[PDB]
From a paper:
The 70-nm-diameter mature alphavirus virion comprises 240 E2–E1 heterodimers that are arranged into 80 trimeric spikes with T = 4 icosahedral symmetry. The E2 and E1 proteins facilitate binding to entry factors and subsequent membrane fusion. Here we present near-atomic-resolution cryo-electron microscopy reconstructions of VEEV virus-like particles alone and in a complex with the ectodomains of [name].
Cryo-electron micrographs of VEEV virus-like particles (VLPs)17 with or without bound [name](D1) were acquired using a 300 kV Titan Krios system equipped with a Gatan K2 detector. Single-particle analysis with imposed icosahedral symmetry yielded reconstructions at resolutions of 4.2 Å and 4.3 Å for the apo and complexed structures, respectively. Twenty of these trimeric spikes sit on the icosahedral three-fold (i3) symmetry axes, and the other 60 spikes sit on the quasi-three-fold (q3) axes. Mature E2–E1 heterodimers assemble into trimeric spikes at the plasma membrane before budding and release of the virion from the host cell. Local resolution estimation performed in RELION revealed heterogenous resolution; the [name] proteins and membrane proximal regions of the E2–E1 heterodimers were best resolved (about 4 Å) and the membrane distal regions and [name](D1) were less-well resolved (about 5–6 Å).
Numbering used by the authors:
A (entry chain K), B (entry chain I), C (entry chain J), D (entry chain L): 114 to 275
E (entry chain F): 372 to 423
The structure:
Amino acid sequence: KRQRMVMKLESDKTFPIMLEGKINGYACVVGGKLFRPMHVEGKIDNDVLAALKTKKASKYDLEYADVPQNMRADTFKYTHEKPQGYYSWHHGAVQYENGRFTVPKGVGAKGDSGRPILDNQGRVVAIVLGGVNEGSRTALSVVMWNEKGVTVKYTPENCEQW
Amino acid sequence: KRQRMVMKLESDKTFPIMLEGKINGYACVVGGKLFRPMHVEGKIDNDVLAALKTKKASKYDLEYADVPQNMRADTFKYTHEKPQGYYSWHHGAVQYENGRFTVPKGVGAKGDSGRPILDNQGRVVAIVLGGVNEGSRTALSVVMWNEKGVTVKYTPENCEQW
Amino acid sequence: KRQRMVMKLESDKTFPIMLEGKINGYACVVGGKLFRPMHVEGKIDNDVLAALKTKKASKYDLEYADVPQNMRADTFKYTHEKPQGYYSWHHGAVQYENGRFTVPKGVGAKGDSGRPILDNQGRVVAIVLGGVNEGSRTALSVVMWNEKGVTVKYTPENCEQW
Amino acid sequence: KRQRMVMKLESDKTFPIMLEGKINGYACVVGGKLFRPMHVEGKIDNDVLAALKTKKASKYDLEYADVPQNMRADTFKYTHEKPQGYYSWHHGAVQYENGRFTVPKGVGAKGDSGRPILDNQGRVVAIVLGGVNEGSRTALSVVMWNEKGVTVKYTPENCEQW
Amino acid sequence: SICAAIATVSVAASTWLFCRSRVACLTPYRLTPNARIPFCLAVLCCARTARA
């Protein structure tokens, strides 16, 4: 499964945020428009996408920009059906329970911001922005969207920017 | 042939123009003095060569500088004999016809400025500065020099800086 | 022997001084505090060590900084017993005679500043800062410390910063 | 060796400091008089020895008391010959270098205060009072006595009471 | 004013000499790998030197 998830993430145009040769984060295109975590500095690893001017949203520490329709051709597919269970992402599985996403300890660190969370159908359900040490596991700070289109950010108390 | 061309380009001191870890172009030494495309920003990948002060030539968007004789020891050999036919360069072959250089489509892009064009004897006949989409092929904007020493720049209408 | 010397230098935390992707020198931690040649520009290849503020010493063209005790755990071991004979360093052996260190010609060049000199027990006896062409050999400009704690810099006449 | 060291420590009258059923430290008799770390609270695991009134020494955080001659019959043997090398104690070996005792990381913790350091002849050379994290090893804060009878306490900066 | 200017120049020269002496003293007070230099401060006593 993880192999297929990585293949889908690579085939879909996704590009890390390069600064001085160091990967400081990741950015992706979902729903035909680029998003980028504001706290991560640097430029997307795509000259064509870098040409797009972004807008800031301090409340969520996220940026967004318009993507040309021809490049909107193949982007992430979002869904609002988020039942309890387990999902898949770049560094393995993620447990969804009580409305929160959690992964085993040692998974995720500074520089992983921007990795989406995929369902069994390969549809995006959340975007990972950070996390906090949770003993045997760690809880990720993510943003998810309901069927009504409301942006909800779940942030654990004293969450670290990962 | 392309293998030998790459070997000759590497053995001869040639250095890309590095800026923030990104290759934005190339520069070479021909006739014992360094040349650099003015539109490309950054510094040559050679501290000793970077110490040389360049002079600007807006008309051709090119720069030049004096190279020490000891470093003039091994530079590109230029020739004025430019008959019609095919030549070789870093990304393969180039067709010369009607006084213009053309290569198949998909060959050459932003960041290739500075790559010279070599003959069967390994002598430089032109310097590639840009290009423009030409359907099944693309036409490169190049500068060539006649036996009388006249600098002539061939620029297709609405040519893009490649 | 050289294999063991390289293994000891690598296992002990040593980091080259990176500038624009180029190795311009080396820096190491001896006696639990970092030292860096002042003439070499750039930052240590360690974010944690780069956080340490250095102090300048123009007289010897060297810098120093305090290292956290937890990182002082494993540093170079210095000794004052410097008898005549041969020692080992990164680029092979070094001859010590008349109070001066000399190595065969062709060993050492610009960018090697900071390489320590080790004895048979793996203890540091000197730090290489430069050198000068000495015919069949070359003499390195080094700093060594006596049992009384006196810093002595041996600099050949017209020595070049290597 | 460690087996013999433990056998010698057990045969010689040594008793942990019990408080509410918890071992909070250790105390021993050397040179015919009992010593106890002042920071450790509780009573010696010996009713006869507990009957002895102790005197305080704030400077070293240590206590001492007179032991009856009949019980002075068999106590620790102290020596002033402390050459560099390795010694043995309850939790294994200890490295002595530069006048300081160091042991590998993970050896020693809160409650080990009072464990003496023995030489190859089973003679006491130092008493362990605390320690501090030193990366791959840890440095113990100990007290040692020279042939002139001077009490010297070596305490690393920001040493923790172990 | 002439006397004041001369005194100011003298003070500046003394300060410069003190700074150069401090630099010269700090020259052996560099890393000198031991992370411990009590004895140079105890001998030279240039300024802010050995507590004992």
